């Protein structure tokens, strides 16, 4: 019986309209206490450019969040030249009851997010 | 004349964002810190002129922090985003690069443009 | 359903519930435009049932999303009265998500699968 | 003293980061009696990817236009496919004071807008 992560991520490579496939991803969260990121995960999207099971629903509480996305290596191993060496989402979670999607739509020379659920 | 702009576009109503703080910052490659080179502000149109001088622009690593979660308060709404971060690489320096924002409180993108 | 859609409102960072969509075939031949499906997103911003997987054939298509009644139905304005994306379908294997990401003054669309 | 029209463009191919130059642009209004798009002007962007001149100020009246920017063409001259054969933005023009920006930013499969001034 499937365990569903309530933060999602999607990787689309606008440029080819195709998924992006092998991107390292990197998730951390501000520590309160003392202000330092912790690193919480690190993954690597799946053939369809995403992120399956990055955080469970007890770890999930509200604070700031960043994900890493490493786009300089994700076009460096496509033979290309990116623009963004990476890119960095930071986010405040506050309504922990709710699904937050997080993706990146990206090109060599662009890229987008957006919050959805 | 900077080689470097940008430009703050709200999306959500169709207007440039004014008064958004930006600092752009350039990446020491042999430690990993990040340098401040000029903190400005955009002004009623959206832009920030004289963020850098042609003698200082360099190839390097360089990012812009837009201080968004501030903008959107003192607009009276919250943001999803504390702060958008964009790093980019210039390895070419006598081009002209302009890198804008164009932002909702729950969507932002940035593009290459010259 | 090889063809699906979502609809994001990307200044309330919400499912944009309750937009008329209709989907249309080009005649390739008369450059008149056929109607195929008249759908309303529901509350996760989806429009399920599009096309059905035999209708689906190659040829060019058009979706138009009713951006302005769907801005005037929240009580506010939209510089756009509608939304139509026009797009080739050449291989009718693929799934094609069209989705449309919209705020009152801006909008994006992606090829998706 | 150079005259501005009151409705601006910008295309730009953010696959590239280039301007896309060499686009054939179609600016219509909607009639008021039929109910048909009448073309205004045809164009074809410059280097930088602009097209000055669209409209004069005494023909930029209140009213519905549509800008068509030939996506399918301009991709084919470059030779790669598109898959948009065209794109239309229909916008309605009421506050005639104001200066308008009707940007295109696009990659094989993938575009946006937005309103500017």
Request: include cysteine; charged fraction near 15%.
């Amino acid at each position: 019986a499937t365990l569903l992560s309530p933060l999602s991520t999607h990787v689309l490579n606008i440029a080819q309209g195709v998924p992006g496939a092998n991107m390292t991803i990197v998730l951390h969260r501000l520590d309160p206490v003392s202000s330092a990121w912790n690193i919480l995960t690190t993954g690597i999207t799946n053939d369809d450019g995403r992120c399956p099971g990055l955080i469970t629903k007890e770890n999930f509480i509200a604070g700031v969040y960043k994900m890493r996305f490493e786009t300089g290596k994700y076009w460096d191993a496509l033979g290309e030249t990116c623009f963004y060496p990476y890119v960095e989402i930071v986010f405040t979670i506050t309504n922990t009851s709710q699904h937050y999607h997080v993706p990146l739509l990206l090109s060599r020379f662009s890229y987008s997010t957006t919050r959805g659920s």
